[PDB]
Amino acid sequence: ALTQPASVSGSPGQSITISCTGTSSDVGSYNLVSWYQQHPGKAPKLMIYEGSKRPSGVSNRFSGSKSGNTASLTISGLQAEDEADYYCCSYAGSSTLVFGGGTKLTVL
Amino acid sequence: QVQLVQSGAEVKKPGASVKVSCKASGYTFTGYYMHWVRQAPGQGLEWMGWISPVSGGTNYAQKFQGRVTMTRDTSISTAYMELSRLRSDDTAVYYCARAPLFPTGVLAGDYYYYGMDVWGQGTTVTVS
Amino acid sequence: EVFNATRFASVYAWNRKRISNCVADYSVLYNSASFSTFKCYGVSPTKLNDLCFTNVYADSFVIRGDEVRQIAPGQTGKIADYNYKLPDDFTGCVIAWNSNNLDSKVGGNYNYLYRLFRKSNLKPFERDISTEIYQAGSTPCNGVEGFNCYFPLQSYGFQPTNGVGYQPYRVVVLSFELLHAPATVCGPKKSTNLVKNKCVNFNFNGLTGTGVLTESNKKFLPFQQFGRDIADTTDAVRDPQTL
Amino acid sequence: DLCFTNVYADSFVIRGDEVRQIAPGQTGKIADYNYKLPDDFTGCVIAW
Amino acid sequence: FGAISSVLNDILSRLDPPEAEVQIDRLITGRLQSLQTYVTQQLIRAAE
Amino acid sequence: FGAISSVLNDILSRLDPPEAEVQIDRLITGRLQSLQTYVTQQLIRAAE
Amino acid sequence: EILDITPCSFGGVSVITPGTNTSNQVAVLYQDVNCTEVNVFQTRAGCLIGAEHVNNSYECDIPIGAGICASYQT
Amino acid sequence: AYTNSFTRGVYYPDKVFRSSVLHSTQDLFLPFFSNVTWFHAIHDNPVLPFNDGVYFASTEKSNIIRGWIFGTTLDSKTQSLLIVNNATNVVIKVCEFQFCNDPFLGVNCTFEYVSFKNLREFVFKNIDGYFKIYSKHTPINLVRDLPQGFSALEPLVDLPIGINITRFQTLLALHAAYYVGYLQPRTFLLKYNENGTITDAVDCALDPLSETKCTLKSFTVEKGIYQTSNFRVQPTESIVRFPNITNLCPFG
Ligand SMILES: *[C@@H]1O[C@H](CO)[C@@H](O)[C@H](O)[C@H]1NC(C)=O
Ligand SMILES: *[C@@H]1O[C@H](CO)[C@@H](O)[C@H](O)[C@H]1NC(C)=O
Ligand SMILES: *[C@@H]1O[C@H](CO)[C@@H](O)[C@H](O)[C@H]1NC(C)=O
């Protein structure tokens, strides 16, 4: 029920950003944002929790932010391995911790 | 070492019901809201529900509210998901989702955070 | 039926067995070295087979290793306040032994639950099986869990690889009560021969003294066991064997 | 009903995106180069 | 006077010395206080 | 009167304040009771 | 402003009565207090209820206080 | 309907034998001369609370009152104590029976026991989960109201049920007036004669004469004047006084 790009393109080393807007009720009112990264044939891997906090082990290049109803995942220094899908989510009032259209990041 | 084995692939006829098994180990089984998240082939990922093996408490998506029945047997430490009245867009790969923390984080928002240990794959091909 | 039981109950739903009209030698409770903890507060353990009380209740359950120290008068804690409260003037004893080899599955025994959320402290010898969703926050919880609405019970993780502090411990408590009713349960204490008209040491249902017992004519009611004087001393006694 | 020894009022003006960066253990440009809050922060913050 | 019962036989047969001693101490202190009051009353009555 | 010794200096030199205080309390309680008995007897004898 | 603090009505109460086989009538006297916050006679010894004040003086039967006392008569 | 309780509501407080002694003790007793509820059975069996014990009086001529139930909800959802007596057998149970809209008699089980012209007095109390039931039967000749007199109750039933009870109800035998009252923690002075039977009782929570009786520890007070601890007037409210401090904090 969230809206993120379906695919974002960037160059190696560049700082790219992928946003996703929810509503004033889900993103505009909760710092419960979620950012996953999934590789093809692989399980989804959490990248960012609570809007801007990084779980243990997640590389610092992934940074989180939010403005009103849109959260933002900023990957500084894009790498070849940074090619994957990203799935943001926001608490929606009930159930539960789902996401956006999913964005495939390609590194030219 | 959280190990998570999902049951095998299935083919189904539409309108029928499918039951997928989900056997966990390597951690405190009952201490997690475990979710069930699906994804159509080459599509986006789709969450379906979660369960507490403790107290049997669970909660599904309104989209799935009514067609999904999620159960668990903590003795073998194994959760289960059923979807009756199947159809074509139900063809997808399903997983469970073991959560990051423990809900002894009294208000640690547990378990509204995440799934840290995801399951291998369960392909449901609902084709006549 | 308690010690050699195949299964026990949960923490909050502890098993309560009331005993009446039996004998207990208590010697098996002393020689058995399997008991990790044996703390008698109200009555000394050595002087147990020579006293006598009216009734006794045995409350058995299974808890964590760290909670074993919580069964004490005046002691506070999670189990001591939300699962089982012991009065300060508790006249009884507590036994506890580790059973990690029995009550622990290969992947974790989750059949044992304990209450962790409650808005009030429990009363002495109170049993509460209220499964209502606890309201931690200010929002009402109308049968729906989630934020500020958590389950009042939580399951134990009993794995064979856990430390001694997180191991399952079977804990039983014996509570004795003594009223004016005839004393039922105590040690065997074989009755000696009755002798009349002689200064001897008399003992009746624990009441021990020295005096001369003589035939009487006071008609005592069927429920009147002992007779006291103005100075609270015993003046007449009913034979616990014959009327 | 609790009354303390001393009060410290830190006043400033930030951007609309930095409103989420004012919290103990926050990451960002403002939370690292301009104003950082300790993890054991005993107080409150009001932004308008 | 703080004891569990006014009869000493119950304490002697039930409790161990580590606490029977303090119970007996309380009992004998109360009893000696009462005896002192009684003998003072008897002394003043005998003087009268 | 329940103390380990009738002499006070040995109690002060052998025990710590946490228990020396209780020992001194018991000793002064016993001595005060004995002094009350003595002064009551003295008042009775003085009246006679 | 200055305000004086005074402990309100408190004082050892008492109850006077003749023998049991004579009658069952009883009187109650609140001593050293004025029973305004509670057949009443107010004297320096407090206030007595149950008895009737009579101007005719007689021999004192049961001493009450302040030269006043009660009896049981027709 | 309401009626008086001149001298009823007395029983043996313990099982200690006494003889020719005046013993004062505080326990749950029925206040003397208090108003008690009255019900009829002509041509009527509501649920009454069980806050602090109940005293019951039944004037019977054909054994109509034949059952009593104690509990909280009385809908087979919790444990309830049922006591019935069919004219030759006394059945006592604590099981959870399914009760109808109006339980009566026509002409999870943890305990089970199987064994106007008549005034039967009963008293039911709960002490630390122990249900105590005392009773006393006597022959009387009265139809209008309760006859005035003094009669103690002997200890009959003591059950360690440990069941929280807040309400109770009676059960008749359809093809019988009765009085109910509540107990209070009162201090009573009882007189034991040479036979050990309670012949008289004084309740010093009623009038100052009984107060002096409790004081002198005797049923007969001589000509004189006495009392006990003083009566003090309690404060009506609380008055908080604090400064009007003018200095504000320059948060503005
Ligand atoms: C009360 O009894 C005494 C002693 O027998 C007697 O002298 C007195 O007259 C009696 N009182 C009355 C009012 O008869
Ligand atoms: C005592 O109270 C009475 C009213 O009951 C009043 O008339 C009298 O003046 C009062 N006496 C004093 C000394 O206040
Ligand atoms: C007491 O009991 C005896 C024994 O039957 C009886 O003879 C007597 O009348 C009773 N009453 C008194 C006052 O002794």
Short mmCIF file of N, CA, C and O in Angstrom, two decimals, chain A residues 6-88:
data_model
loop_
_atom_site.label_atom_id
_atom_site.label_comp_id
_atom_site.label_asym_id
_atom_site.label_seq_id
_atom_site.Cartn_x
_atom_site.Cartn_y
_atom_site.Cartn_z
N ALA A 6 9.71 1.54 -8.99
CA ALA A 6 9.84 0.13 -9.35
C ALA A 6 11.28 -0.23 -9.69
O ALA A 6 11.68 -1.39 -9.54
N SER A 7 12.07 0.74 -10.15
CA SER A 7 13.47 0.50 -10.48
C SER A 7 14.20 1.84 -10.50
O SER A 7 13.70 2.82 -11.05
N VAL A 8 15.39 1.86 -9.89
CA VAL A 8 16.24 3.05 -9.88
C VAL A 8 17.59 2.68 -10.48
O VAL A 8 18.11 1.58 -10.28
N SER A 9 18.17 3.63 -11.21
CA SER A 9 19.43 3.42 -11.90
C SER A 9 20.48 4.38 -11.36
O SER A 9 20.20 5.56 -11.14
N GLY A 10 21.69 3.86 -11.14
CA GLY A 10 22.78 4.66 -10.65
C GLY A 10 24.11 4.13 -11.14
O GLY A 10 24.20 3.02 -11.67
N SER A 11 25.14 4.94 -10.95
CA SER A 11 26.50 4.58 -11.30
C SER A 11 27.27 4.16 -10.06
O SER A 11 26.89 4.50 -8.94
N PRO A 12 28.36 3.40 -10.23
CA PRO A 12 29.16 3.02 -9.06
C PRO A 12 29.75 4.24 -8.37
O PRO A 12 30.20 5.18 -9.02
N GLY A 13 29.74 4.21 -7.04
CA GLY A 13 30.31 5.29 -6.26
C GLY A 13 29.36 6.44 -6.02
O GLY A 13 29.56 7.25 -5.11
N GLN A 14 28.31 6.54 -6.84
CA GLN A 14 27.34 7.62 -6.70
C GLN A 14 26.43 7.39 -5.50
O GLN A 14 26.24 6.25 -5.06
N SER A 15 25.87 8.47 -4.97
CA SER A 15 24.88 8.39 -3.90
C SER A 15 23.48 8.48 -4.50
O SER A 15 23.06 9.53 -4.99
N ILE A 16 22.76 7.37 -4.44
CA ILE A 16 21.42 7.30 -4.99
C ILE A 16 20.45 7.22 -3.82
O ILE A 16 20.83 6.88 -2.69
N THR A 17 19.20 7.58 -4.08
CA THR A 17 18.16 7.56 -3.07
C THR A 17 16.88 7.00 -3.67
O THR A 17 16.54 7.29 -4.82
N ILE A 18 16.19 6.17 -2.89
CA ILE A 18 14.89 5.64 -3.26
C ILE A 18 13.90 6.01 -2.16
O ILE A 18 14.11 5.68 -0.99
N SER A 19 12.84 6.72 -2.54
CA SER A 19 11.82 7.12 -1.59
C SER A 19 10.62 6.20 -1.67
O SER A 19 10.49 5.39 -2.59
N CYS A 20 9.73 6.32 -0.69
CA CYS A 20 8.42 5.67 -0.75
C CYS A 20 7.47 6.44 0.15
O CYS A 20 7.74 6.63 1.34
N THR A 21 6.35 6.87 -0.42
CA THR A 21 5.34 7.62 0.31
C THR A 21 4.24 6.68 0.77
O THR A 21 3.80 5.79 0.03
N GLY A 22 3.82 6.85 2.02
CA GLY A 22 2.64 6.17 2.52
C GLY A 22 1.48 7.13 2.60
O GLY A 22 1.05 7.68 1.58
N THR A 23 0.97 7.34 3.80
CA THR A 23 -0.07 8.32 4.07
C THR A 23 0.36 9.17 5.26
O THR A 23 1.43 8.99 5.83
N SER A 24 -0.50 10.13 5.62
CA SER A 24 -0.29 10.87 6.85
C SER A 24 -0.52 10.01 8.08
O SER A 24 -0.08 10.38 9.18
N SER A 25 -1.18 8.86 7.92
CA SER A 25 -1.49 7.96 9.02
C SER A 25 -0.43 6.89 9.23
O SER A 25 -0.23 6.44 10.37
N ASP A 26 0.27 6.46 8.17
CA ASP A 26 1.23 5.37 8.30
C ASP A 26 2.66 5.90 8.41
O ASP A 26 3.37 5.57 9.36
N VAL A 27 3.07 6.74 7.46
CA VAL A 27 4.43 7.28 7.51
C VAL A 27 4.45 8.61 8.25
O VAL A 27 5.31 8.86 9.10
N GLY A 28 3.49 9.49 7.94
CA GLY A 28 3.44 10.80 8.57
C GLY A 28 3.18 10.78 10.06
O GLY A 28 3.23 11.85 10.69
N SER A 29 2.93 9.61 10.65
CA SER A 29 2.60 9.52 12.06
C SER A 29 3.37 8.44 12.82
O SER A 29 3.17 8.32 14.04
N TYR A 30 4.21 7.66 12.16
CA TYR A 30 4.94 6.59 12.82
C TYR A 30 6.38 6.54 12.35
O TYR A 30 6.67 6.54 11.15
N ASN A 31 7.29 6.48 13.32
CA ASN A 31 8.70 6.22 13.05
C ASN A 31 8.97 4.72 13.14
O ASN A 31 9.88 4.24 13.82
N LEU A 32 8.15 3.97 12.41
CA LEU A 32 8.21 2.52 12.40
C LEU A 32 8.51 2.02 11.00
O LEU A 32 8.04 0.97 10.57
N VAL A 33 9.32 2.79 10.28
CA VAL A 33 9.59 2.53 8.87
C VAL A 33 10.49 1.30 8.77
O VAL A 33 11.21 0.97 9.72
N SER A 34 10.44 0.64 7.63
CA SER A 34 11.18 -0.59 7.36
C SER A 34 11.79 -0.52 5.98
O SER A 34 11.14 -0.13 5.01
N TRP A 35 13.05 -0.94 5.87
CA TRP A 35 13.72 -1.05 4.58
C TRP A 35 14.40 -2.41 4.48
O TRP A 35 15.31 -2.71 5.26
N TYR A 36 13.95 -3.21 3.50
CA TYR A 36 14.51 -4.51 3.17
C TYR A 36 15.30 -4.42 1.88
O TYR A 36 15.00 -3.59 1.02
N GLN A 37 16.25 -5.34 1.71
CA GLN A 37 16.89 -5.60 0.43
C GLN A 37 16.84 -7.10 0.16
O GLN A 37 17.15 -7.90 1.04
N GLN A 38 16.45 -7.46 -1.06
CA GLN A 38 16.33 -8.85 -1.47
C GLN A 38 17.11 -9.05 -2.76
O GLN A 38 17.03 -8.23 -3.68
N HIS A 39 17.85 -10.14 -2.83
CA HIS A 39 18.52 -10.52 -4.05
C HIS A 39 17.74 -11.64 -4.74
O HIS A 39 16.98 -12.37 -4.09
N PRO A 40 17.88 -11.78 -6.06
CA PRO A 40 17.12 -12.81 -6.78
C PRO A 40 17.37 -14.20 -6.22
O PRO A 40 18.51 -14.60 -5.97
N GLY A 41 16.28 -14.94 -6.02
CA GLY A 41 16.36 -16.24 -5.40
C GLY A 41 16.80 -16.24 -3.96
O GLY A 41 17.26 -17.27 -3.47
N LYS A 42 16.67 -15.11 -3.27
CA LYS A 42 17.13 -14.99 -1.89
C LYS A 42 16.04 -14.36 -1.03
O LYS A 42 15.15 -13.66 -1.52
N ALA A 43 16.14 -14.62 0.27
CA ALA A 43 15.17 -14.10 1.21
C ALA A 43 15.36 -12.59 1.40
O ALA A 43 16.46 -12.07 1.18
N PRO A 44 14.31 -11.88 1.79
CA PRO A 44 14.45 -10.44 2.03
C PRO A 44 15.30 -10.16 3.26
O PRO A 44 15.11 -10.76 4.32
N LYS A 45 16.24 -9.23 3.11
CA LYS A 45 17.15 -8.87 4.18
C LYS A 45 16.87 -7.45 4.63
O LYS A 45 16.95 -6.51 3.83
N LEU A 46 16.53 -7.31 5.90
CA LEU A 46 16.36 -6.00 6.50
C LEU A 46 17.60 -5.14 6.30
O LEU A 46 18.73 -5.63 6.44
N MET A 47 17.39 -3.88 5.95
CA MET A 47 18.47 -2.90 5.89
C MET A 47 18.31 -1.80 6.93
O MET A 47 19.29 -1.44 7.59
N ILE A 48 17.11 -1.27 7.10
CA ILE A 48 16.89 -0.11 7.96
C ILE A 48 15.66 -0.34 8.82
O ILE A 48 14.61 -0.76 8.33
N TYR A 49 15.80 -0.05 10.11
CA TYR A 49 14.69 -0.15 11.04
C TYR A 49 14.46 1.20 11.71
O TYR A 49 15.40 1.98 11.91
N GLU A 50 13.20 1.47 12.02
CA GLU A 50 12.79 2.67 12.75
C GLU A 50 13.23 3.95 12.02
O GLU A 50 13.76 4.88 12.62
N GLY A 51 13.00 3.97 10.71
CA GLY A 51 13.22 5.18 9.94
C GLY A 51 14.66 5.46 9.57
O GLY A 51 14.97 5.66 8.39
N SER A 52 15.55 5.48 10.57
CA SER A 52 16.95 5.82 10.31
C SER A 52 17.94 4.95 11.07
O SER A 52 19.15 5.23 10.99
N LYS A 53 17.50 3.93 11.80
CA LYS A 53 18.40 3.10 12.58
C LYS A 53 18.81 1.86 11.79
O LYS A 53 17.98 1.23 11.12
N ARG A 54 20.09 1.51 11.88
CA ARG A 54 20.63 0.37 11.17
C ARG A 54 20.75 -0.83 12.09
O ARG A 54 21.38 -0.73 13.15
N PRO A 55 20.15 -1.97 11.74
CA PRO A 55 20.35 -3.18 12.55
C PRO A 55 21.81 -3.59 12.54
O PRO A 55 22.61 -3.14 11.71
N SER A 56 22.16 -4.45 13.49
CA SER A 56 23.54 -4.92 13.59
C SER A 56 23.94 -5.66 12.31
O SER A 56 23.21 -6.51 11.81
N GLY A 57 25.12 -5.31 11.80
CA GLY A 57 25.65 -5.94 10.60
C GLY A 57 25.39 -5.19 9.31
O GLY A 57 26.15 -5.38 8.35
N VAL A 58 24.36 -4.36 9.24
CA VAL A 58 24.03 -3.65 8.01
C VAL A 58 25.09 -2.59 7.75
O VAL A 58 25.50 -1.86 8.66
N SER A 59 25.55 -2.51 6.50
CA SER A 59 26.59 -1.57 6.15
C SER A 59 26.09 -0.13 6.28
O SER A 59 24.93 0.17 6.00
N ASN A 60 26.99 0.75 6.70
CA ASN A 60 26.66 2.15 6.93
C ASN A 60 26.20 2.87 5.67
O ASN A 60 25.43 3.84 5.80
N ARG A 61 26.61 2.43 4.48
CA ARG A 61 26.23 3.10 3.24
C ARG A 61 24.73 3.24 3.08
O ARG A 61 24.28 4.14 2.37
N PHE A 62 23.95 2.38 3.73
CA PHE A 62 22.50 2.50 3.75
C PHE A 62 22.10 3.45 4.87
O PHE A 62 22.42 3.20 6.03
N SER A 63 21.42 4.53 4.51
CA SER A 63 20.98 5.51 5.48
C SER A 63 19.48 5.72 5.31
O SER A 63 18.95 5.63 4.20
N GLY A 64 18.82 6.00 6.41
CA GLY A 64 17.37 6.12 6.41
C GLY A 64 16.96 7.51 6.83
O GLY A 64 17.65 8.18 7.60
N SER A 65 15.81 7.93 6.31
CA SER A 65 15.25 9.22 6.67
C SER A 65 13.75 9.17 6.40
O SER A 65 13.24 8.22 5.80
N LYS A 66 13.05 10.21 6.84
CA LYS A 66 11.64 10.34 6.51
C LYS A 66 11.24 11.81 6.62
O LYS A 66 11.75 12.55 7.46
N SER A 67 10.32 12.20 5.75
CA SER A 67 9.79 13.55 5.71
C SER A 67 8.29 13.43 5.52
O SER A 67 7.84 12.91 4.49
N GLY A 68 7.53 13.88 6.51
CA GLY A 68 6.09 13.74 6.44
C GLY A 68 5.71 12.29 6.18
O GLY A 68 5.96 11.40 7.00
N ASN A 69 5.15 12.05 5.00
CA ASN A 69 4.60 10.75 4.65
C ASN A 69 5.50 9.92 3.74
O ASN A 69 5.06 8.88 3.26
N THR A 70 6.73 10.35 3.50
CA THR A 70 7.62 9.60 2.62
C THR A 70 8.92 9.27 3.34
O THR A 70 9.59 10.16 3.88
N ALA A 71 9.27 7.99 3.37
CA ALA A 71 10.55 7.54 3.86
C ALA A 71 11.56 7.50 2.72
O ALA A 71 11.19 7.47 1.54
N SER A 72 12.83 7.47 3.08
CA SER A 72 13.91 7.60 2.11
C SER A 72 15.06 6.69 2.51
O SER A 72 15.54 6.75 3.65
N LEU A 73 15.50 5.86 1.57
CA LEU A 73 16.69 5.05 1.71
C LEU A 73 17.77 5.59 0.78
O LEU A 73 17.60 5.59 -0.44
N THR A 74 18.87 6.05 1.36
CA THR A 74 19.97 6.63 0.61
C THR A 74 21.17 5.70 0.68
O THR A 74 21.68 5.42 1.77
N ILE A 75 21.59 5.21 -0.48
CA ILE A 75 22.78 4.37 -0.59
C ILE A 75 23.88 5.22 -1.19
O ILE A 75 23.84 5.57 -2.37
N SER A 76 24.86 5.57 -0.36
CA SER A 76 26.03 6.30 -0.82
C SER A 76 27.09 5.31 -1.29
O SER A 76 27.26 4.24 -0.71
N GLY A 77 27.79 5.68 -2.36
CA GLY A 77 28.80 4.80 -2.92
C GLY A 77 28.22 3.50 -3.45
O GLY A 77 28.46 2.43 -2.88
N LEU A 78 27.45 3.59 -4.53
CA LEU A 78 26.84 2.41 -5.12
C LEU A 78 27.91 1.42 -5.56
O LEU A 78 28.95 1.80 -6.10
N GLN A 79 27.65 0.13 -5.31
CA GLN A 79 28.55 -0.94 -5.69
C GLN A 79 27.82 -1.92 -6.61
O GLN A 79 26.59 -1.90 -6.72
N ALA A 80 28.60 -2.77 -7.27
CA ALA A 80 28.01 -3.80 -8.11
C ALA A 80 27.10 -4.71 -7.29
O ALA A 80 26.02 -5.11 -7.75
N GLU A 81 27.52 -5.05 -6.07
CA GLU A 81 26.69 -5.84 -5.19
C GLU A 81 25.41 -5.12 -4.78
O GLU A 81 24.42 -5.79 -4.45
N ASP A 82 25.38 -3.79 -4.83
CA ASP A 82 24.17 -3.05 -4.52
C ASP A 82 23.03 -3.34 -5.49
O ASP A 82 21.93 -2.80 -5.30
N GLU A 83 23.25 -4.16 -6.51
CA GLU A 83 22.16 -4.57 -7.38
C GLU A 83 21.25 -5.56 -6.67
O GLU A 83 21.61 -6.71 -6.44
N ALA A 84 20.05 -5.09 -6.32
CA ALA A 84 19.02 -5.91 -5.68
C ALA A 84 17.71 -5.13 -5.62
O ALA A 84 17.66 -3.97 -6.04
N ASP A 85 16.65 -5.76 -5.13
CA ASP A 85 15.41 -5.04 -4.90
C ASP A 85 15.39 -4.51 -3.48
O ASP A 85 15.99 -5.10 -2.57
N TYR A 86 14.71 -3.39 -3.30
CA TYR A 86 14.51 -2.79 -1.99
C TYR A 86 13.01 -2.68 -1.75
O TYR A 86 12.25 -2.31 -2.65
N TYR A 87 12.60 -3.03 -0.53
CA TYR A 87 11.20 -3.08 -0.15
C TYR A 87 11.00 -2.29 1.13
O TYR A 87 11.44 -2.71 2.20
N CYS A 88 10.34 -1.15 1.02
CA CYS A 88 10.05 -0.41 2.23
C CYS A 88 8.67 -0.77 2.74
O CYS A 88 7.80 -1.26 2.01
#
